[PDB]
Write a new protein. Structure first.
Ligand SMILES: OC[C@H]1O[C@H]2C=C[C@H]3O[C@H]4[C@H](O)[C@H]5OCC=CC[C@@H]5O[C@@H]4C[C@@H]3O[C@@H]2C/C=C\[C@@H]1O
Lengths: 206, 210
């Protein structure tokens, strides 16, 4: 029903713009359509919403900087947050509710920083069951997506939260499979960094 | 800006246990909402207008309260209830949320499976050298790691990361990455990853020689 789309990274003093594409229901038929964010630390904050009748209601502490609009013809609504700073870094979700029920998007991560966008370096980690790995380091900003064998290997996988140091992130992911399947068959980590348009497949060889 | 203090900040329970968490406001609020959020997914309303259950939410859940003291209760805990619960008030704008209560599910202890990995060739070619260690599927969540190079402990250049409780087996995992320059790496031979956990008095060790 709803999916957020927008800039991965914004620089301070700029305006942040996001779009929520809604399908399955008309944003003009009912429900209040909100923008909600979660800062690193897991602290939630409702930013405001646009009523299905075209009306608005913002969070008082963001009133002067926010603007929520919509395009009824395309069935999508938008968030605009002016003069952002490093505080505004958060995962942004769009959602709708009628008090009795609510629906949420998947959320999109937005980083407000003046740091340099950098592609990641992907290094293979080779050594009944064997554990393999994938080290994704030297990138900015978050997020990166990591899958194994295009996603066919899901259980036995552990992707760890990236760690920031000197404006660069480092992340790792382990996959545990039967010794029968490796090195016999191939295991490959798929890494994506949308912000730098990077996509890498690193086969794990012995 | 009104403040919701949620208690306890963290708690665990075996499936079957009764669970209670509180939401105490710094000012009078006429009602609250409760949201459940599991690792990796978006928040979801679990209780609305303090005592009310949205459709699809299990009846083992109930909420009650007034004035400045609210609470959420689970009559009989199930493994699938593990998540972080947030309370929210909407009596005043801004409709402030609480910092949350992270409900974890307990299980039998489990020692960690430890794996160490030397730097790859591609990285060495870049003048960099990272040694990675994984401590996976352990429990409880308390654990330590120590890096030793040729016998002596190494503390600088270590980045650690911890996952949230696994949704299938309720274990925790950890990743420790030691990064050195290529030349510092080649000045030594033995690289050790040492893990100390409740399930064993002596630390588990894995290692490799350059
Ligand atoms: O102007 C009156 C009041 O406006 C507020 C009214 C209602 C609140 O609606 C809440 C939504 O039900 C809830 O939907 C789903 C998921 C997450 C959060 C979302 O939060 C909304 C907060 C909202 O507060 C509005 C402003 C707060 C007080 C105003 O006095």
């Amino acid at each position: 029903q709803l999916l957020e789309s927008g800039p991965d990274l914004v620089k301070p003093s700029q305006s942040l713009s996001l779009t929520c594409t809604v399908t399955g229901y008309s944003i003009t038929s009912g429900y209040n359509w909100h923008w909600i964010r979660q800062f690193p630390g897991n602290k939630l904050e409702w930013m405001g919403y646009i009523h299905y009748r075209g009306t608005t209601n913002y969070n008082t502490s963001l009133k002067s900087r926010i603007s929520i609009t919509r395009d009824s013809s395309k069935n999508q609504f938008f968030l605009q947050l002016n003069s952002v700073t490093t505080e505004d870094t958060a995962t942004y979700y769009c959602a709708c509710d009628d008090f009795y029920s609510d629906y949420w998007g998947q959320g999109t991560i937005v980083t407000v920083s003046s740091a340099k966008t950098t592609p990641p370096s992907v290094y293979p980690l080779a050594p009944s069951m064997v554990t393999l790995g994938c080290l994704v380091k030297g990138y900015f900003p978050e997020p990166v997506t990591v899958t194994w064998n295009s996603g066919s290997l899901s259980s036995g996988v552990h992707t760890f939260p990236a760690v920031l140091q000197s404006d660069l992130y480092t992340l790792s992911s382990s996959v545990t499979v039967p010794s029968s399947t490796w090195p016999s068959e191939t295991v490959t980590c798929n890494v994506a960094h949308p912000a730098s348009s990077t996509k890498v497949d690193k086969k794990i060889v012995p | 800006e009104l403040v919701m203090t949620q208690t306890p900040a963290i708690m665990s329970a075996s499936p079957g246990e009764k669970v209670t968490m509180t939401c105490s406001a710094s000012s009078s609020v006429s009602s609250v909402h409760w949201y459940q959020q599991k690792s990796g997914t978006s928040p979801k309303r679990w209780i609305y207008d303090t005592s009310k259950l949205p459709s699809g939410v299990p009846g083992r859940f109930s909420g009650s309260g007034s004035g400045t003291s609210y609470s959420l209760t689970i009559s009989s805990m199930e493994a699938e209830d593990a998540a972080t619960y947030y309370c929210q008030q909407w009596s005043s704008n801004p409709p402030t949320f609480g910092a949350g209560t992270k409900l974890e599910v307990k299980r039998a202890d489990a020692a960690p499976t430890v794996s160490i990995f030397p730097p790859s060739s591609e990285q060495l070619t870049s003048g960099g050298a990272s040694v990675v260690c994984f401590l996976n599927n352990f429990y409880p969540k308390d654990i330590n790691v120590k890096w030793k190079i040729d016998g002596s402990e190494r503390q600088n250049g270590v980045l650690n990361s911890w996952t949230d409780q696994d949704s299938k087996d309720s274990t925790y995992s950890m990743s420790s990455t030691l990064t050195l320059t290529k030349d510092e790496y080649e000045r030594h031979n033995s690289y050790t990853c040492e893990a100390t956990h409740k399930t064993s008095t002596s630390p588990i060790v894995k290692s490799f020689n350059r």
